Amino acid sequence: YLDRKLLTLEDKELGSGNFGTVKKGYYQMVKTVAVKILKNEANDPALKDELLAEANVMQQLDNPYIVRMIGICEAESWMLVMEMAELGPLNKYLQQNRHVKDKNIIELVHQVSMGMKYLEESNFVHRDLAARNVLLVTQHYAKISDFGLSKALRADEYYKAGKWPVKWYAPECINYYKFSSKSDVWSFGVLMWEAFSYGQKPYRGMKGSEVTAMLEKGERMGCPAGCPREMYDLMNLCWTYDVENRPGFAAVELRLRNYYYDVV
Amino acid sequence: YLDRKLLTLEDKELGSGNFGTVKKGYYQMVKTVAVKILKNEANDPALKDELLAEANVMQQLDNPYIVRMIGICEESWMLVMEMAELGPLNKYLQQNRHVKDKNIIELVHQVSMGMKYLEESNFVHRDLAARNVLLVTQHYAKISDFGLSKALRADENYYKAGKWPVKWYAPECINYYKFSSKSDVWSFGVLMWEAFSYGQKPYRGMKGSEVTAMLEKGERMGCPAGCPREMYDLMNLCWTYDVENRPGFAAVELRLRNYYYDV
Amino acid sequence: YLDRKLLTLEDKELGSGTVKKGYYQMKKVVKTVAVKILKLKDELLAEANVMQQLDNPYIVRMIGICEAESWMLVMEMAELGPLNKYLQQNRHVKDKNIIELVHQVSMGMKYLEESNFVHRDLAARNVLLVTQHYAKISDFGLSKALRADENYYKAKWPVKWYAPECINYYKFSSKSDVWSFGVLMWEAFSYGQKPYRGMKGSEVTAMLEKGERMGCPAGCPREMYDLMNLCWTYDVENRPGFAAVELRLRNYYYDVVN
Amino acid sequence: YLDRKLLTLEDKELGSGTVKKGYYQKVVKTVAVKILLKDELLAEANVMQQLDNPYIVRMIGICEESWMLVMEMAELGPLNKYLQQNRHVKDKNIIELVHQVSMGMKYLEESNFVHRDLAARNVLLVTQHYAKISDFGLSKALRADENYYKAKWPVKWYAPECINYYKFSSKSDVWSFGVLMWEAFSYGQKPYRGMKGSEVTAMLEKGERMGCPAGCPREMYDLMNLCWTYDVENRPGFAAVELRLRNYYYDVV
Numbered sequence A: 001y002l003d004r005k006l007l008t009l010e011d012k013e014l015g016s017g018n019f020g021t022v023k024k025g026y027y028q029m030v031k032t033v034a035v036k037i038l039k040n041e042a043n044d045p046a047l048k049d050e051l052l053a054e055a056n057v058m059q060q061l062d063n064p065y066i067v068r069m070i071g072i073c074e075a076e077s078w079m080l081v082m083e084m085a086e087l088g089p090l091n092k093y094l095q096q097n098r099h100v101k102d103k104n105i106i107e108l109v110h111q112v113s114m115g116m117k118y119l120e121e122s123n124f125v126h127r128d129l130a131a132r133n134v135l136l137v138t139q140h141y142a143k144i145s146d147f148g149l150s151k152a153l154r155a156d157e158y159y160k161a162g163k164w165p166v167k168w169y170a171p172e173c174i175n176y177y178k179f180s181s182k183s184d185v186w187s188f189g190v191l192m193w194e195a196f197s198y199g200q201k202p203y204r205g206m207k208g209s210e211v212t213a214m215l216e217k218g219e220r221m222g223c224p225a226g227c228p229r230e231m232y233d234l235m236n237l238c239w240t241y242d243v244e245n246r247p248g249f250a251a252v253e254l255r256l257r258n259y260y261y262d263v264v
Numbered sequence B: 001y002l003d004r005k006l007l008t009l010e011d012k013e014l015g016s017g018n019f020g021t022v023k024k025g026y027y028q029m030v031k032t033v034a035v036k037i038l039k040n041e042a043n044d045p046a047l048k049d050e051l052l053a054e055a056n057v058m059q060q061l062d063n064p065y066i067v068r069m070i071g072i073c074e075e076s077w078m079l080v081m082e083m084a085e086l087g088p089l090n091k092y093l094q095q096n097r098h099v100k101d102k103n104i105i106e107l108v109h110q111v112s113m114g115m116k117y118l119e120e121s122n123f124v125h126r127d128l129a130a131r132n133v134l135l136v137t138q139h140y141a142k143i144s145d146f147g148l149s150k151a152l153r154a155d156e157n158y159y160k161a162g163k164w165p166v167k168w169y170a171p172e173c174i175n176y177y178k179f180s181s182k183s184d185v186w187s188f189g190v191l192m193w194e195a196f197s198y199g200q201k202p203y204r205g206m207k208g209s210e211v212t213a214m215l216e217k218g219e220r221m222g223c224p225a226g227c228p229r230e231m232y233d234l235m236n237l238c239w240t241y242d243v244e245n246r247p248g249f250a251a252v253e254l255r256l257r258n259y260y261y262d263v
Numbered sequence C: 001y002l003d004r005k006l007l008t009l010e011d012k013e014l015g016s017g018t019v020k021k022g023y024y025q026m027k028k029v030v031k032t033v034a035v036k037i038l039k040l041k042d043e044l045l046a047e048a049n050v051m052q053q054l055d056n057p058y059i060v061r062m063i064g065i066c067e068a069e070s071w072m073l074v075m076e077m078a079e080l081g082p083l084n085k086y087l088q089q090n091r092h093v094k095d096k097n098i099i100e101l102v103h104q105v106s107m108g109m110k111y112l113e114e115s116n117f118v119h120r121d122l123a124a125r126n127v128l129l130v131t132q133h134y135a136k137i138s139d140f141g142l143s144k145a146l147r148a149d150e151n152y153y154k155a156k157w158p159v160k161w162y163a164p165e166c167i168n169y170y171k172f173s174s175k176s177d178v179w180s181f182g183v184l185m186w187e188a189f190s191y192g193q194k195p196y197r198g199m200k201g202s203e204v205t206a207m208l209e210k211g212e213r214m215g216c217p218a219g220c221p222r223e224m225y226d227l228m229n230l231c232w233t234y235d236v237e238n239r240p241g242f243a244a245v246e247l248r249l250r251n252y253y254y255d256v257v258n
Numbered sequence D: 001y002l003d004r005k006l007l008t009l010e011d012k013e014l015g016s017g018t019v020k021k022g023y024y025q026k027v028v029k030t031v032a033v034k035i036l037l038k039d040e041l042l043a044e045a046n047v048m049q050q051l052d053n054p055y056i057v058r059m060i061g062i063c064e065e066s067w068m069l070v071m072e073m074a075e076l077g078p079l080n081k082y083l084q085q086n087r088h089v090k091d092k093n094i095i096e097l098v099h100q101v102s103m104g105m106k107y108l109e110e111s112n113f114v115h116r117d118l119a120a121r122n123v124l125l126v127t128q129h130y131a132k133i134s135d136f137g138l139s140k141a142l143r144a145d146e147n148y149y150k151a152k153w154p155v156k157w158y159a160p161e162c163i164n165y166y167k168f169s170s171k172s173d174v175w176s177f178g179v180l181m182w183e184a185f186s187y188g189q190k191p192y193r194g195m196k197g198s199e200v201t202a203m204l205e206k207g208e209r210m211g212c213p214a215g216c217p218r219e220m221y222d223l224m225n226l227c228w229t230y231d232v233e234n235r236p237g238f239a240a241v242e243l244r245l246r247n248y249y250y251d252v253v
C-alpha cells in the first residue's frame, strides 16, 4: 500500500475502460508509473476484487517480460500503480502503426512467449492472454499485463472455474471450464493472429457459440496478409484441439526463438 | 498430385513402421494433415504399389468415419491425409486403460457405420483391425489403411485373392481366398475383441495354422474382462463360421446402435 | 569411354585389383564414385557390358569405363563397402536390421530375375552398403544374360555358393542364384563368417548331395533359417524363385517391425 | 572480471546484430568488445578461457554498464564480409586462410571441444594472411565418456547426424568446414541461397551437394565433398583435412 502524497499524476488520461482510467504518473520510492484508477471511488465490488486479485498475482512475479507492480494506493479512489510501458496496448499500437515489419512482430510475440514460459514454470495460468493485454515499453520490448483472471495452479492439479473472453479460450475451457498452461498456449495463438493482423479483433462478427461450433469442425481463422507460413503454422499448432498434443510454452518459445534468428 | 512447396512438416515423427514414417503437417488449400512418408525414397516397389492402391480407393470414398485423402506428393512419395490426431486405436487403448466400456461401444459403432458405408459402396477392406482405426478424438473414430482394399465386381459376391493378416481373416479367406463384406464382418469381430481388450493382440503366441485349427473346431477367443455379455455375443455372431449365416454390416451397425442407445 | 581428366582419385585404397574412392565431374557438380582399378581387360569390359543394361535402386550403378593410365570401372559409391566386412566389424547389428538388408538384396535379385540375368556370384562380399539400412548388389564379373531360347546359362568358381545343378551340370538359372542367396543369408546372420569353413570344394559337394546343410547361426530366427533351407532345395523346380523369396522376407520383416 | 576503468571504447560500432574497437590497459592492448542471454555470454567466456592457440581468438576477459566480452582485436573482421568487399583475393590466398582455420580446428579437435557454429562469418582476419576462429557461443567440451555432444541452429552448416540425431562431434565440425570452404571460394556468398532448412536437409539426404564455385580448383572442391561425406566414420578428421590443405598449399606455392 502506497502513499498518495508521494504520487503525482499527469492531467490527461492515457486511456479508459469499463474499470475507469489509466494515467501516467511519478512515484517517489522517482519512477515513471502507469496508474489504473477505478471509476466512481471503486464503489463497484467486482472492480475492487479484480484490482486485489491482479495485484496479488503481480506481487509474486518477477520477469523482464511481465509488468512490475509498484503497489496499491487507496486514496480518492483505488489505484494500481505499475511500471510504465510507454507505448501501451499492442493491438491499439499496431492499428496505428501499419508500417511495423513482420520481423518486428516476431520479436515482440517471441518476448510474450518468454514471459508466458516463465508463467508456465511458475505454475500460473493467465486466462486472458490477448493482444490488448500486451503492453509496449518500446516498439522492440513487450510486457504482459492484466492478471485479473490469472490463477496459481494447485500442486494436486488444470484450474477448474466474471469475464469470459470466449474468442481466446481453448475447447477444453469452453466445454469443461478447465484452464491450463496449454489453455494459455491456445490463447497465445489467437494473440499471434491479432499481431500479424495489426490489431484486428478475432472472429469478427461471430457469436460465442458460432466460434465454438467453428472450432469443433476443425475450422480456424485464416492466414493474415503478409504473415509468413511458419508463423501461421505455429498458430495452427497452438490451435491443436487436443490438450496433450498441444505444445507447451517451452516448445512454443523455442520455435519462435529459432525462427527469429533465421529472419535476420 | 500435390505441391511439395505448399506442404510443411513437423520435425518429430508421430510413428513409424515397415513402410517408413508418419508425420504431422499442414497443407494449403491450410489443413492439418497426417503424412505417410515412404522410406528410402520409395525405392521399394511394393511400398509404392500399396500407396497407389491406398490413394485410388480413398479417392472414391466420402464418409465421416473414413479417413479423407488430400493427395499424393512425390523427396519421397507422400500420402497426405486429413489428420486424426490421436492415432491408432490399439495404441491409444494400451495407453488409456481408463476408457469406459460405453466409450468403446461408441467407437466401435462408428467403425461399423464406416463399414456399412463400405459394404454399400461394394468395397472390401481386407485389413480391418484395431491398428487401422484412427482416433480423431476419444469420441470419433475413422477407418484407414486401404492398401488391401478392393472394389467388388458387379458379377461377383466376393473377391478371390502381399500381407496376410491371418488372425483377422474368416475361414473362407484362409481356406478359399474368398473376401466379401461378410469376411470384413469377421475381422470386425476380432477388432471388437481388440478394443475391449484395450489393444491386446489377438491369439497371442499362436501360429496361423494353430488359429485356423482352433476356429475349425468351433473354439473362439474368450470374453475380455469387463466386456458386456451382449458385446461378446455380437463378437461370436460376427465369428459365425458359415458365410451365409454371418450378419452383414447393416445388421451389425443396428445392433451396436441399439445397445449404445440402451447404455 | 569416360574422360580421365574429369576424374580424380583419393590416394589411399579402399581395399585390395584395387578399389578407390574418387570423384567424377558431371556439370557443376561432382559425383562420388568407387573406382575398380585393374592391376584380363576383356573381363572388365564384359562386366561393364552387363552393368550398362541394369537400372535398379538395389543394384550398383555404373558411371562408365575409363581407359587411362590403368583400366578403370567407375561406379556410384556405396560408402560402407562389402556387407561381409561390415558385419565382421559391427557384431551388434540387429537381426531386424539384417532382415531389412537381405530383403533389399532379394528385391535387387527379383529385378535381375525379371530382366533375364543370372548373377552367378551372389555372396555377402558382393553386397555393398550405402548405409547400414540400404544395400546394393555389385560385382557382375560372372553375370550372364539368359538367351530367349533357354531357361539357363550353360558354361574362377565360387563353388561354396553354387547349387548342385551348377556343380554337376554347369547349368545356371535364377533358381541357381536363389541357392546362393541362401548361402548369403547364412553369411549375413553369421556376421560375415565364411560358409563351410575348413572344407574343400569336393567335401561341400558331397555333403550337399547327402542332404546335409550348414547349421542355424546362433541367434538366427527360425523363420529365416527355414527360408535358407528352402533356398537350399535340391530340386530346381521345387526351389522358390525370387518373387516368392522377396515376398517371404517382405512379410516377415513386416511381422518383426510389428 | 576486468576493470571497466581500464577499458576505453571507440564511439562508432564495428558491427551490430554490438561489436566495438577499444583499448584495455604501461601498454594498452587493442581489443574488440562484444557488448550485449547473459548466461550465454558467460558460457562463451567459459569456453574461451580454456583455449590457447594462435588460430583462435583469445579472450581478455569479461567486464560487468553492459555485459562485455573483451577479446584481442582481429582488425579485418569477419571473413565472409571481407571477401564480399575484396573480390580479387587470389585463390592461393584463400587456401592459406582456410588452412589456418583447419589448424585452429585441429587444435579444438585435439582439445576435445566441438565448435558447433563453424562458418565463414565466425572466421576473423588479423591480416589478409592470418585468420582466427571466433564465436564460441555454441561450443561444447566433450565429456570423456562420450564421442559426441547430444543436444539457435545454423542448419545450413550442420551435418546430417546433427540434424537427424542432435549429435555433434569434431566430424560434424568437419562438415561445417566444407561449407566454410565453399563460402570462402564463393567470396562470402551464403550457402544454399533461397532454400529453407527443410529443403537443405532433403537435398543432402538425396546425395546432392552445392556446386563448385567459379574459379575453385578441383582439388579444393573434392576436399569440400570429402568433408560432406554423409557417413560420420568415413568422414575425415581435422588431422587429415589439415594435411590435405597443407600439402596442396605447398603445391600451389
Ligand SMILES: CO[C@H]1CN(Cc2cn(-c3ccnc(Nc4ccc5c(c4)c(C(=O)C4CC4)cn5C)n3)nc2C)C[C@@H]1O
Pocket (backbone or CB within 6 Å): A014, A015, A016, A017, A022, A034, A036, A067, A082, A083, A084, A085, A086, A087, A088, A089, A132, A133, A135, A145, A146, A147
Ligand atoms: C483490457 O483493456 C486494457 C486493460 N489494461 C489496463 C492496464 C494498463 N496497464 C499498464 C501498465 C503499465 N503500463 C501501461 N502503459 C500504457 C501506455 C499507454 C496507454 C495505455 C497504457 C492505455 C490503456 O491502458 C487503455 C485502457 C486501454 C492507453 N495507452 C495509450 N499500462 N495495466 C493495466 C491493468 C490494458 C488493457 O489494454
Ligand SMILES: CO[C@H]1CN(Cc2cn(-c3ccnc(Nc4ccc5c(c4)c(C(=O)C4CC4)cn5C)n3)nc2C)C[C@@H]1O
Pocket (backbone or CB within 6 Å): B014, B015, B016, B017, B022, B034, B036, B067, B081, B082, B083, B084, B085, B086, B087, B088, B131, B132, B134, B144, B145, B146
Ligand atoms: C503400423 O500400422 C499403421 C499404418 N498406418 C499408418 C497410417 C496412419 N494414417 C493416418 C491418417 C490420418 N491421421 C493419422 N494420425 C495419426 C496420429 C497420431 C499417430 C499416428 C497417426 C501414428 C501412426 O500411424 C504409427 C504408424 C503407427 C502414431 N501416432 C501417434 N494417421 N494413415 C495411415 C495409412 C496406421 C497403422 O496403425
Ligand SMILES: CO[C@H]1CN(Cc2cn(-c3ccnc(Nc4ccc5c(c4)c(C(=O)C4CC4)cn5C)n3)nc2C)C[C@@H]1O
Pocket (backbone or CB within 6 Å): C014, C015, C016, C019, C034, C036, C060, C075, C076, C077, C078, C079, C080, C081, C082, C125, C126, C128, C138, C139, C140
Ligand atoms: C573381394 O571381392 C570384392 C570385389 N568387389 C569389388 C567391387 C567394389 N565395388 C564398389 C562399388 C561401389 N561402391 C563401392 N564402395 C566401397 C566402399 C568401401 C569399401 C569398398 C567398396 C571395399 C572393397 O571393395 C574391398 C575389395 C573388397 C572396401 N571398402 C572399405 N564398391 N564394385 C566392385 C566390383 C567388392 C567385393 O567385396
Ligand SMILES: CO[C@H]1CN(Cc2cn(-c3ccnc(Nc4ccc5c(c4)c(C(=O)C4CC4)cn5C)n3)nc2C)C[C@@H]1O
Pocket (backbone or CB within 6 Å): D014, D015, D016, D017, D019, D032, D034, D057, D071, D072, D073, D074, D075, D076, D077, D078, D121, D122, D124, D134, D135, D136
Ligand atoms: C554472427 O555475426 C558475428 C558475430 N561475431 C561477433 C564477434 C566478433 N568478434 C571479434 C573478436 C575479435 N576481433 C574482432 N574484430 C573485428 C574487426 C572488424 C569488424 C568486426 C570484428 C565486425 C563484427 O563483428 C560485425 C558483427 C559482425 C565488423 N567489423 C568491421 N571481432 N567476436 C565475436 C563474438 C562475429 C560474427 O561475424
